[PDB]
Design a protein around this nucleic acid. Structure first.
Ligand SMILES: [Mn+2]
Ligand SMILES: [Mn+2]
Ligand code: NA
Length: 344
DNA sequence: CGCTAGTCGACAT
DNA sequence: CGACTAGCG
């Protein structure tokens, strides 16, 4: 996510209870619940031994949401973004490393280091996610598998008015331009809420409370799509965007050293990287649940060419997109692993 | 003051 | 993932 963002816009948050959204619709970044629950049965999961504790763990939160008259829409991550393959597979390397090393630490009796290794080897698979999907759908809870990152799908669901709030632990949702984000929610319904409108409460932001400038700030400070320039954090990026009311962000980036009074050299790789990052935050492919088709998060502008946004996602047939979104088609093998029908 | 790289906790007994 | 902090510009 956006490192340090929560403490940076700390003044835009407030302690709430989900009772506020009684009789409303709320989408959930289920992976947080999935991972948090996978922590408990980390040993058995990493060993390959059968376990289903994380399912019940998620269903705790689900039932808690249902008890307050809240309609939850569980969202799951789908295909890995074509650009983020490297980072993900490297994460896989680290996980496998902690697994094998953890087992070697089990050979030596080091139980604490072992557990701490196995808990850092947690790989949330699509099988686990689908198990959670079945569990929720048996309780009448809608589930949706995002075409790619669940973040963009949630952002769309909130922007479209389909849901009123987003439950997550990842600050990326704020960079995608969510209206209401519920953070740090326990199994009882206590959590922090960050509304976009109240971004103005943060004096540090200045005039950088507009979605475009906010996105620019998040990207410049360093995001999942692009590493920041050395010595650039949230404050200095915010300062760059504050001092520069120039709409053309590229020219602004090129003379960042002028605004920060530092000696910074900007490679073209960072310019193109910024453009691709912004295009990924703006036009990452999501699934319209109503019209049942693949659409960009935001509508394509006249200045952007959709034929050059392969890194933001790739289009498939709407029927296939529907089968993937329903979780009936496997992400990797494209095989029918289920046959759920929401029209019965 | 701000930024970076790193550590540590999460669950739950 | 974030919270948190030593080390440094
Ligand atoms: Mn995500
Ligand atoms: Mn994210
Ligand atoms: Na940074």
């Amino acid at each position: 996510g956006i490192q340090g963002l929560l403490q940076f816009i700390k003044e835009a948050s407030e302690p709430i209870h989900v009772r506020k959204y009684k009789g409303q619709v709320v989408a959930v970044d289920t992976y947080c619940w999935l991972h948090k629950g996978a922590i408990a049965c980390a040993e058995k999961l990493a060993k390959g031994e059968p376990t289903d504790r994380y399912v019940g763990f998620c269903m705790k939160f689900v039932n808690m949401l249902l008890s307050h008259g809240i309609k939850p829409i569980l969202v799951f991550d789908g295909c890995t973004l074509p650009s983020k393959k490297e980072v993900e597979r490297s994460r896989r390397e680290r996980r496998q490393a902690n697994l094998l090393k953890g087992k070697q630490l089990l050979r030596e009796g080091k139980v604490s280091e072992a557990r701490e290794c196995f808990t850092r080897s947690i790989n949330i698979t699509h099988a686990m996610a689908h198990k959670v999907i079945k569990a929720a759908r048996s309780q009448g809870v809608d589930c949706l598998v995002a075409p790619y990152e669940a973040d963009a799908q949630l952002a769309y669901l909130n922007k479209a008015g389909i849901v009123q709030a987003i439950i997550t632990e990842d600050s990326d949702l704020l960079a995608f331009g969510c209206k209401k984000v519920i953070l740090k929610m326990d199994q009882f319904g206590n959590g922090l809420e960050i509304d976009q409108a109240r971004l103005g409460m943060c004096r540090q932001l200045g005039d950088v409370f507009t979605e475009e400038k906010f996105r620019y700030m998040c990207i410049l400070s360093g995001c999942d799509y692009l590493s920041s320039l050395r010595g650039i954090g949230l404050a200095k990026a915010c300062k760059v965007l504050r001092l520069a009311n120039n709409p053309d962000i590229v020219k602004v980036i090129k003379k960042i050293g002028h605004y920060l009074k530092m000696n910074i050299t900007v490679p073209e790789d960072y310019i193109n990287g910024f453009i691709r990052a912004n295009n990924t935050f703006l036009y990452q492919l999501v699934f319209d649940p109503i019209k049942r088709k693949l659409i960009p998060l935001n509508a394509y502008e006249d200045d952007v060419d959709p034929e050059t946004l392969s890194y933001a996602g790739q289009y498939v047939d709407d029927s296939i997109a529907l089968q993937i979104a329903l979780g009936n088609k496997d992400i990797n093998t494209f095989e029918q692993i289920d046959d759920y029908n929401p029209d019965t």
